[PDB]
């Protein structure tokens, strides 16, 4: 029943940003690949994703998310959101590539509820 927010930022300089966030949260990234890095932060509970943008001058929000523990949680979330009247798109186990629900806010900000 626990979850944590996911904050995905599109950054102009991945290397600079990896350094900054390591110092900010006091821990190194969990995964680094060309073009992206992930941090799993304990306090505050957070999944931080850094995506190389390079074709822009300043950091911008890429997407937002809620990372849940299992497939059953994604299902419950999907049903609750749909019941609430939100327009949702869902991909889930009945084995899925990824168990996930997508919704978008009125200002265009995209949200995803998912399992790692």
Swiss-Prot record:
Domain VOC: 3-116
UniProt temperature dependence: Exhibits robust catalytic activity from 37 to 55 degrees Celsius.
Alphabetically ordered keywords of this record: Dioxygenase, Iron, Metal-binding, Oxidoreductase
Residues that, per the record, bind Fe(2+): 6, 63, 112
Cofactor(s) listed in the protein's UniProt record: Fe(2+)
Record-level GO BP terms: response to cadmium ion
Entry binding sites for roxarsone (III): 62
Effect of residue 100 to A: Nearly inactive. High decrease in iron affinity
Source domain of life: Bacteria
EC annotation from Swiss-Prot or TrEMBL: 1.13.11.-
Effect of residue 98 to H: Retains catalytic activity similar to the wild-type
Variant or mutagenesis effect after changing residue 98 to A: Retains less than 5% of wild-type catalytic activity
Function text: Nonheme iron-dependent dioxygenase that can break carbon-arsenic bonds, playing a role in the detoxification of environmental organoarsenical compounds. Catalyzes the oxygen-dependent demethylation of highly toxic methylarsonous acid (MAs(III)) to arsenite, which can then be exported out of the cell. Can also cleave the C-As bond in several trivalent aromatic arsenicals, including roxarsone (III), nitarsone (III) and (4-aminophenyl)arsonous acid.
Further remarks about this protein from its record: Organoarsenicals are used as herbicides, pesticides, antimicrobial growth promoters, and chemical warfare agents. Arsenic is the most widespread environmental toxin and is classified as a Group 1 human carcinogen.
Protein's name according to its UniProt entry: Trivalent organoarsenical cleaving enzyme
Originating species: Thermomonospora curvata (strain ATCC 19995 / DSM 43183 / JCM 3096 / KCTC 9072 / NBRC 15933 / NCIMB 10081 / Henssen B9)
Gene designation: arsI
């Amino acid at each position: 029943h626990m979850s944590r927010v996911q904050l995905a930022l599109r950054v102009p300089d991945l290397e600079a940003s990896i350094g900054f966030y390591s110092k900010l949260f006091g821990t190194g990234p969990a995964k680094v690949r060309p073009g992206y890095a992930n941090f799993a932060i304990a306090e505050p509970p957070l999944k931080l994703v850094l995506i190389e943008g390079a074709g822009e001058d300043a950091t911008r929000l890429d997407h937002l998310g809620v990372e849940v523990e299992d497939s059953a949680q994604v299902g419950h979330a999907a049903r609750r959101l749909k019941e609430s009247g939100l327009a949702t798109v869902e991909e889930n186990d009945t084995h899925a590539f990824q168990d996930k629900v997508w919704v978008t806010g009125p200002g265009g900000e995209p949200w995803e509820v998912y399992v790692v």
